[PDB]
């Protein structure tokens, strides 16, 4: 047994581009060695460190709007900076396996392929969907890829490795909503403050008492959008630290009796949220009484999944319900997976097997797309599907029929 048919590893720099955080890394590896914010400090500074140093303007902008790249200049800048700094690998030295959303337009896809084959001259390229990779990451050919990115929640189903484009449900509920609600709650109870970006030093503060600190005399940073991003940073920190998802219909009788939890703001202001820390992660599943939009009509996570299942043929639903694939950042919140499982079980029609893949223990759910991309690249049979430079220079440059 020589294992000649094991697999092949030929470059394939996977670049999973995401609205909250972009990911990258070589194929064959299990975890992406590159993970930094996606928003660039456009005056271009794109790095976990460069994006935290005060300068003249440094306006924050995310090239991907609704998961769709629109500002090609900023996208090219991000790619070039990533390569040069983290990878240090020549552009035209290794292929690329960038990922895309299931709702990528044909014109935008062709433009991405052109940018890949013209300014970088990479030896080969292949653009696979994010849901497909997320499914391959879990070794699943059929299932519901419940993406919960920072700007969209979509239960995309896949059939035999192919995404069902008509089954996607782009629910606005996402991390941005949770962050906005947390910002509103803070502004209601206290004043949201910038991270240490401006705080010179903190002091001891009694729980619930006003905090005292020293202001830095650095640049004013008139750009409010940058201040908004710096505040969203702390908002996301709060969300991932203490914010917890309810486990029931969220009646106002049990939450008042649960244990209390603490949290310290950048300035040292200590406050407890044990009473309403689970009020914000409610619209995700029950968007019926959210204070922000009381007269809205949205579908929760379970509702989105049920709709995505129903909009597709019934012949595949047995393989969709039984292989629900939870992914994305929002899911790492405490009790999120359990609440989702409970809601789907009480909602899903009995006699149909419902199984939630046990992958919430680790934070690898975010990187599921990159893991699936690296897995696909490491395959030997897949080595023929790459869009080589010859196929592009020939004149076709048609990724629709080839993908």
């Amino acid at each position: 047994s020589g294992g000649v048919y094991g697999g092949d590893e030929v470059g394939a720099l996977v670049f999973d581009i995401g609205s909250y955080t972009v990911r990258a890394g070589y194929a064959g590896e299990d975890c992406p060695k590159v993970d930094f914010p996606t928003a660039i400090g456009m005056v271009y500074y794109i790095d976990t460190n460069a994006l935290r140093v005060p300068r003249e303007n440094m306006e924050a902008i995310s090239p991907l709007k609704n998961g769709m790249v629109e500002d090609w200049d900023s996208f090219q800048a991000i790619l070039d900076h990533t390569y040069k700094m983290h990878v240090k690998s020549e552009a035209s030295l290794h292929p690329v396996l960038m990922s895309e959303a299931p709702w990528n337009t044909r014109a935008k896809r062709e433009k991405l392929t052109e940018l890949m084959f013209e300014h970088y001259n990479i030896p080969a390229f292949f653009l696979c969907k994010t849901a497909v990779l997320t499914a391959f990451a879990n070794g699943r050919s059929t299932g519901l890829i419940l993406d919960s990115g920072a700007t969209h929640t979509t239960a995309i189903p896949v059939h035999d490795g192919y995404v069902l484009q008509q089954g996607i449900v782009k629910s606005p509920l996402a991390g941005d909503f949770i962050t906005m609600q947390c910002r509103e709650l803070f502004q209601e109870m206290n004043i949201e403050l910038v991270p240490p970006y401006m705080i010179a030093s903190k002091e001891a503060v009694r729980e619930g008492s006003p905090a005292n600190w020293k202001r830095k005399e650095k640049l004013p940073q008139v750009t409010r959008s940058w201040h908004n991003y710096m505040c969203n940073c702390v908002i996301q920190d709060f969300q991932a630290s203490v914010l917890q998802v309810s486990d029931s219909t969220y009646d106002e009788q049990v939450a008042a009796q649960m244990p209390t939890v603490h949290y310290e703001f950048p300035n040292g202001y200590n406050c407890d949220f044990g009473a309403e820390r689970l009020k914000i992660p409610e619209g995700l599943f029950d968007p019926s009484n959210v204070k922000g939009l009381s007269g809205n009509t949205m579908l929760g996570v379970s509702h989105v999944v049920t709709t995505s299942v129903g909009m597709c043929d019934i012949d595949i639903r047995p393989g969709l319900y039984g292989s629900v694939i939870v992914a994305g950042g929002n899911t790492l919140i405490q009790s999120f997976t359990d609440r989702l499982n409970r809601e789907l079980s009480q909602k899903t029609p009995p006699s149909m097997r419902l199984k939630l893949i046990a992958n919430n223990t680790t934070v690898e759910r975010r990187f599921s797309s990159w893991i699936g991309g690296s897995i696909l690249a490491s395959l030997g049979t897949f080595q023929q599907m790459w869009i080589s430079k010859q196929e592009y220079e020939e004149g076709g440059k048609q990724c629709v029929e080839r993908k």
């Binding site: 990451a137 070794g139 490795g161 696909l376 395959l379 049979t381 897949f382």
Partner: protein
């Protein structure tokens, strides 16, 4: 009925690679845990 196409074997190889990656991640984690624990135990033993 129809014969297995290219993608039919590609998906099997993909599942194989996925389970391989899944096993290898946990193997690396367990090996690293073993190494750190053995090193700290050796340090404590040397001090004792």
């Amino acid at each position: 009925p129809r014969p297995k196409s290219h993608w039919d074997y590609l998906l099997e190889e993909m599942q194989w690679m996925a389970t391989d990656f899944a096993q290898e991640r946990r193997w690396k984690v367990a090996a690293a845990k073993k190494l750190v624990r053995t090193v700290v135990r050796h340090h404590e033993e040397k001090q004792l």
